[PDB]
Design a binder for this molecule. Structure first.
Ligand SMILES: [Zn+2]
Ligand SMILES: [Zn+2]
Ligand SMILES: [Zn+2]
Ligand SMILES: [Zn+2]
Ligand SMILES: [Zn+2]
Ligand SMILES: [Zn+2]
Length: 430
């Protein structure tokens, strides 16, 4: 699995303070300056030391500590009033302003949730106020504690090895030794998410691609109001069949016809060998046609992928309900002394494996939509077809568990898991 850790806010504070003190000792700088450097360089100590040896002036400028190199005032530039010399503060940029206006500036910014990003009051000036400068300018303790909380938030966000738990009101931090776009789960609120973008787990797609896909699903006119079909007419009977299970292999109870929920085409074409339902039938010479036909083809392709994305989500939901009913039936058998949980554990294992596999499959479709043509896309489409075929086989067998024995169900489990593993090892990239 992915090697991650769940730390409390106290442990995270301790780790961050250790890093700060080490860097402040090494660089012969104050703690606030060291924090500024660490935040600007995402707490990557190696790059910080390398660039400090390369150009210390450029490092202090980029970290917003010193102004770019390329007699008092007694007049604050924002309140226009004359003030005392001691009540006239400034950063290294020497932009001087009076103490009352500094207090007002910091108080407003902190009240608006700003932590690290408090900057000089002069336009364009990139300098950022260090902690030891802001803290005396905050009068009350709730303001100082708000500032500390926002600073800790910004520190965990900027730290390349740490991420705040997206769970609502969850005071946990997820730590990772080598940050990648992989699945993590907080052990206090059970929130699952991708480590890189802090959104829903989305393998094999990367973070940018899935963000684009979600925005397109929500914004495009043809999909913003989309509702998946609850019922469909049997290709043989025309009877209104309802989709209650997650398995897309439907058998009409009236005529015994086996068809596919996405196609309305017969199921004997949807075996593991020669699985075609998941590939988009692309047009090769449609780049050489009119803009009308090109836009129509773009709509066709987008809908082909989006409908399967949506239907696999719906199937995940329906299969979760099926798993709940299975759990209830095993509970009933156990209390009736018809067996024990160990003898039906294979069924719940199959259900969890099916959920995992169909999650992966659901996310394979944005990946296939945003892929460019070529042999890599053909390889991905073959692996995706194998995954989908074995997934629908496993879901059929899980929905009808009393008609199948332990052996073939575990075999289908292993087959679907192997297909999912192959897809992930080939296409879950950096
Ligand atoms: Zn002023
Ligand atoms: Zn300034
Ligand atoms: Zn959590
Ligand atoms: Zn991500
Ligand atoms: Zn029928
Ligand atoms: Zn199909």
């Amino acid at each position: 699995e992915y090697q991650f850790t769940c730390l409390t806010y106290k442990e995270s504070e301790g780790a961050l303070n250790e890093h700060m003190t080490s860097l402040a000792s090494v660089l012969k700088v104050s703690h606030s300056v060291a924090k500024l450097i660490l935040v600007n360089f995402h707490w990557q100590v190696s790059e910080i030391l390398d660039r400090y040896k390369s150009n210390s002036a450029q490092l202090l400028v980029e970290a917003r500590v010193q102004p770019n190199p390329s007699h008092p005032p007694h007049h604050c530039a924002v309140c226009m009033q004359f003030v005392r010399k001691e009540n006239l503060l400034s950063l290294a940029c020497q932009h001087q302003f009076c103490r009352s206006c500094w207090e007002q500036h910091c108080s407003v910014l902190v009240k608006d949730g700003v932590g690290v990003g408090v900057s000089c009051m002069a336009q364009d000036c990139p300098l950022r106020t260090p902690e030891d400068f802001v803290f005396p300018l905050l009068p009350n303790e709730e303001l100082r504690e708000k500032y500390r909380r926002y600073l800790f938030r910004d520190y965990v966000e900027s730290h390349y090895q740490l991420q705040l738990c997206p769970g609502a009101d969850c005071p946990m931090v997820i730590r990772v030794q080598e940050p990648r776009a992989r699945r993590v789960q907080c052990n206090r609120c059970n929130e699952v998410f991708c480590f890189k973008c802090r959104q829903m787990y989305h393998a094999p797609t990367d973070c940018a691609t899935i963000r684009k896909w979600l925005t397109k699903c929500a914004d495009d006119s043809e999909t913003a109001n989309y509702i998946s079909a609850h019922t469909k007419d049997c290709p043989k009977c025309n009877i209104c069949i309802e989709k209650n299970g997650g398995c897309n292999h439907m058998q009409c109870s009236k005529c015994k016809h086996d068809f596919c929920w996405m196609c309305l085409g017969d199921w004997k074409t949807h075996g593991s060998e020669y699985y075609e339902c998941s590939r988009y039938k692309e047009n090769p010479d449609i780049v050489n046609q009119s803009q009308q036909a090109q836009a129509r083809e773009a709509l066709k392709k987008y809908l082909f992928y989006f409908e399967r994305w949506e239907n696999h989500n719906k199937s995940l939901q329906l299969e979760a309900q099926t798993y709940q009913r299975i759990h209830e039936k095993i509970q009933e058998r156990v209390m009736n002394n018809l067996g024990t949980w160990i003898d039906w554990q294979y069924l719940q294992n199959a259900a969890k494996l099916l959920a995992k596999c169909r999650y992966t499959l659901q996310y394979t479709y944005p990946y296939a939509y945003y892929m460019e043509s070529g042999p890599r896309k053909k390889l991905f489409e073959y692996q995706q077809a194998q995954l989908e075929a074995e997934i629908e086989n496993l879901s059929w067998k899980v929905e009808r568990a009393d008609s199948y024995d332990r052996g073939d169900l575990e075999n289908q489990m292993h087959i679907a898991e192997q297909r999912r593993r192959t897809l992930l090892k080939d296409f879950h990239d950096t």
